[PDB]
């Protein structure tokens, strides 16, 4: 059960009670290599918990799987009760929100992404387009020099009142196979798809933990992702 004095909080919390099925679709194009990814799994916002398996449906993924983790559903974050009035992501549901990013891989190319996150029936759907340009053919991305792992990370969320949405910018660190690190500097904005009211948050952050694995029975190119996201940074 859920029980909040704000009916707008109640509306979003009710959509994310229990376990929610997730579908992810990504059509990408990086330096002229077209590819698609399909993902399926479940989210349990009560615990900030996501379990997803992604398949490259065009063959071999032309970029490293870790580079797509942030692109491939922050509505499943756990917002503490005393912060639920700051949960933009659930408040935009079920009509959804647009998530847009530019991801600058330092000394390399950049990803431009646009996604619509919304419910289709009971299923939470993340449909994405990605364009990657100016990548080095022998760089860490197109050369597949990134390790298959991921680090824990905090992203700070700010309101974007001009756009009735939010924005964030943050740096992801990708381990390179020779010990060093590839930086991926993310700029992010989110806006509601509908014109109904949303919750615009005070400044806070999301604390993320991600674990990547492989399905030993899966011959297609794939990534198994376990992710926890918790909102923080506002006191009681």
Q: For residues 29 and 204, what is the distance between their CA atoms, to the nearest angstrom?
A: 33
3-state secondary structure of 100: strand
Start-to-end CA span in the chain (Å): 22
Q: What's CA 124's distance to the chain center, in Å? A: 13
3-state secondary structure of 136: coil
- Encode 144-172 in three state secondary structure: CCECCCCCCEEEEEEEEHHHCEEEEEEEE
For 104, phi and psi rounded to 5 degrees? -95, 110
| Number of helices (H), then strands (E), in the chain | 2, 11
Domains of the chain, earliest start first: 7-232 (2.40.155.10)
Q: For residues 47 and 63, what is the distance between their CA atoms, to the nearest angstrom?
A: 31
Q: For residues 148 and 161, what is the distance between their CA atoms, to the nearest angstrom?
A: 38
Cross-strand partners of 169 = 187
Q: What per-residue string of b and e applies to 156-180 under the rule 16 or more CB within 10 Å gives b? A: ebebbeeebbbbbebebebbeeeee
- Work out the angle at residue 129's Cα, subtended by the Cα atoms of residues 125 and 134, and round it to the nearest 5 degrees: 150
- Work out the angle at residue 53's Cα, subtended by the Cα atoms of residues 48 and 59, and round it to the nearest 5 degrees: 150
* Pairing, β 165-175 against β 222-232: unpaired
**What tokens were used for 52?**
């997803």
| Contact predicate 127/119, CB 8 Å | no
* DSSP letter (8 states) at residue 203: S
Exp. method: X-ray
3-state secondary structure of 75: helix
């Amino acid at each position: 059960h859920h029980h909040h004095t704000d009916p707008m909080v109640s509306k979003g919390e009710e959509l994310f009670t229990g376990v929610v099925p997730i579908l992810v679709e990504l059509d990408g194009d990086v330096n002229g290599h077209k590819f698609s990814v399909s993902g399926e799994g479940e989210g349990d916002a009560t615990y900030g918990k996501l379990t997803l398996k992604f398949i490259c449906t065009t063959g071999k993924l032309p970029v490293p799987w870790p580079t797509l983790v942030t692109t491939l559903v922050l509505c499943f974050s756990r917002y503490p009760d005393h912060m639920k009035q700051h949960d933009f992501f659930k408040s935009a549901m079920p009509e959804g929100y647009v998530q847009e990013r530019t991801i600058f891989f330092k000394d390399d190319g950049n990803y431009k992404t646009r996604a619509e996150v919304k419910f289709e029936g009971d299923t939470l759907v993340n449909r994405i387009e990605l364009k990657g340009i100016d990548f080095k053919e022998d760089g860490n991305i197109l050369g597949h020099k990134l390790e298959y792992n991921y680090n824990s990370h905090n992203l700070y969320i700010m309101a974007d009142k001009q756009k009735n949405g939010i924005k964030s910018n943050f740096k992801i660190r990708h381990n390179i196979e020779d010990g060093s690190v590839q930086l991926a500097d993310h700029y992010q904005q989110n806006t509601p798809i509908g014109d109904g009211p949303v919750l615009l948050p005070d400044n806070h952050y999301l604390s993320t933990q991600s674990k990547l694995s492989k399905d030993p029975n899966e011959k297609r190119d794939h990534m198994v992702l376990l992710e926890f996201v918790t909102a923080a940074g506002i006191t009681l």
